[PDB]
């Protein structure tokens, strides 16, 4: 019962240690530009806002209506929803991620630096995403919570190496990409629910998506400033991450049965148009235009090579990674322990 492992060599602290000073200098700047993208706790939605209310007389009927609706939502979509929920639930790993980063790490667990305040508060916001989807999937009766909980335990135990090498450059590019990815992901399931006429479930996915849009805005703004101060290193960091390919946070998924669980879950999300290879290319393309990589000047030869590589990649990937004649048609049906080994098309 061995979960999959990272296949790449672990590289640590690739950012020159003096460049830490940059992020220490940017402390006040982060307070003024990044922290403002967090919603104050009093103003935030909570999972309870979107679930049957167990302290109301309407509890039983609300749970019943939730379940009646869940019967008309196909297994395909539950697999995706479950995979999205499990990814959210591995949260501890993601706080650890941010806290591996050299200039921005929380050194005590309650550090008053803007970066540490961001990290803690961002985590606190993400925590509600798992909570809400958890209780929704639980109440639905459509999924195998024991197997899902098992997957979650494996996933936190496996952790993840995003290949950011303790560099806030690589790291903040990585989270920029991921935040947009989950925005699209959750946004698509929201839109699809709004179409089976499940408004309450659309509200669940929509509210989570809107959190992710704020996070994306914040992280792209950090990288924006890194392109301002250090155009060379940031382009070289952007390019590095592209060459490696952005590996997803939950790629070591394992449920004790399926040795390729991430690929299989991803295939369903692909087929349903929740999150696709096309989406991957669209995100890279968006970040190129967002950070105005095309518009950068005064770069090193190595920087120019990196700049050119980044701008070329999305149309290249949009091609190279389009020819899914194999994946779309032939695709077999396979059991997912997350739904009691009921089967869905891959």
**Measured CA distances, 281 to 26, 190, 311, 316 (Å):** 31, 21, 11, 9
The residue with tokens 């991803």 is 266
Determine whether the annotation assigns residue 196 to a binding site.
Answer: no
Query: With respect to Fe ion, which residue has the nearer C-beta, 137 or 296?
Result: 137
% helix, strand, coil for the chain, step of 5: 65, 0, 30
Determine whether the annotation assigns residue 264 to a binding site.
Answer: no
Judged by beta carbon distances under 5 to 8 A according to partner kind, the member of Fe ion, its own copies, none in contact with residue 212 is: Fe ion
Q: Is 338 a catalytic residue?
A: no
Judged by beta carbon distances under 5 to 8 A according to partner kind, the member of Fe ion, its own copies, none in contact with residue 186 is: none
Q: Is 215 a catalytic residue?
A: yes
Closest by CA position to 167, among listed 73, 241, 271, 59: 241
Q: Could you say which of 102, 144, 215, 240 is catalytic?
A: 215
Cβ at position 295, least distance to its own copies in Å: 33
Q: Is 179 a catalytic residue?
A: yes
Q: Could you say which of 75, 118, 122, 129 is catalytic?
A: 129
Q: Is 126 a catalytic residue?
A: yes
CA pair distance 125, 256, nearest whole angstrom: 30
Q: Residue 196 burial by CB count (10 A; 0-12/13-18/19+): exposed, middle or buried? A: middle
Query: With respect to its own copies, which residue has the nearer C-beta, 163 or 180?
Result: 163
Q: Which residues bind to Fe ion, rule: CB under 5 A?
A: 126, 129, 179, 212, 215
Cβ at position 297, least distance to Fe ion in Å: 33
Q: Is 264 a catalytic residue?
A: no
**Are residues 229 and 22 in contact, defined by beta-carbon separation less than 8 angstroms?**
yes
Q: Is 144 a catalytic residue?
A: no
Q: Could you say which of 182, 189, 207, 276 is catalytic?
A: 182
Given the DSSP bridges, would you call strands 333-335 and 343-345 parallel, antiparallel or unpaired? antiparallel
Cβ at position 249, least distance to Fe ion in Å: 10
Judged by beta carbon distances under 5 to 8 A according to partner kind, the member of its own copies, Fe ion, none in contact with residue 215 is: Fe ion
Cβ at position 190, least distance to its own copies in Å: 21
Cβ at position 198, least distance to its own copies in Å: 17
Query: With respect to Fe ion, which residue has the nearer C-beta, 105 or 129?
Result: 129
Question: What is the 3-state secondary structure of 116-161?
Answer: HHHHHHHHHHHHHHHHHHHHHHHHHCCCCHHHHHHHHHHHHHHCCC
Q: Is 212 a catalytic residue?
A: yes
Q: Could you say which of 84, 102, 126, 131 is catalytic?
A: 126
Closest by CA position to 146, among listed 56, 82, 201, 189: 82
Burial per residue of 302-311, b for 16 or more beta-carbon CB atoms within 10 angstroms, e otherwise = ebeebbebbb
**Are residues 84 and 249 in contact, defined by beta-carbon separation less than 8 angstroms?**
no
Q: Could you say which of 88, 89, 198, 258 is catalytic?
A: 88
Which residues line the annotated binding site for Fe cation?
A: 88, 126, 129, 179, 212, 215
Q: Which residues are part of the catalytic machinery?
A: 45, 88, 126, 129, 179, 182, 211-212, 215
């Amino acid at each position: 019962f061995m979960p999959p492992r990272e296949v790449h060599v672990q590289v640590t602290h690739s950012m020159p240690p003096q460049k830490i000073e940059i992020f220490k200098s940017l402390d006040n700047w982060a307070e003024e530009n990044i922290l403002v993208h967090l919603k104050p706790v009093e103003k935030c939605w909570q999972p309870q806002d979107f679930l049957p209310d167990p302290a109301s007389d309407g509890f039983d009927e609300q749970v019943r209506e939730l379940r009646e609706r869940a019967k008309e939502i196909p297994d395909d979509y539950f697999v995706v929803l479950v995979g999205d929920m499990i990814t959210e639930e591995a949260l501890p790993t993601y706080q650890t991620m941010l806290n591996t980063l050299d200039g921005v790490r929380d050194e005590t667990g309650a550090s008053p630096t803007s970066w540490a305040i961001w990290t803690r508060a961002w985590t606190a916001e993400e925590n509600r995403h798992g909570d809400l989807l958890n209780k929704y999937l639980y109440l639905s009766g459509r999924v195998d919570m024991r197997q899902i909980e098992k997957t979650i335990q494996y996933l936190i135990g496996s952790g993840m190496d995003p290949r950011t090498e303790n560099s806030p450059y690589l790291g903040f590019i990585y989270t920029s990409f991921q935040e947009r990815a989950t925005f699209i992901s959750h946004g698509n399931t929201a839109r699809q629910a709004k179409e089976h006429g499940d408004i309450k479930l659309a509200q669940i996915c929509g509210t989570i998506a809107a959190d992710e849009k704020r996070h994306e805005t914040a992280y792209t703004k950090i990288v924006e400033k890194l392109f301002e101060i250090d155009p060379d290193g940031t382009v070289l960091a952007f390019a590095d991450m592209m060459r490696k390919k952005i590996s997803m946070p939950a790629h070591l998924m394992y449920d004790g049965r399926d040795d390729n669980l991430f690929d299989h879950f991803s295939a369903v999300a692909q087929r349903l148009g929740v999150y696709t290879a096309k989406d991957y290319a669209d995100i890279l393309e968006f970040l190129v235009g967002r950070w105005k990589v095309d518009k950068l000047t005064g770069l090193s030869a190595e920087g120019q090579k990196a700049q050119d590589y980044v701008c070329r990649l999305p149309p290249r990937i949009r091609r190279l990674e389009e020819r899914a004649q194999g994946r779309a048609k032939e695709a077999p049906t396979m059991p997912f322990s997350w739904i009691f080994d009921r089967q869905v098309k891959l």
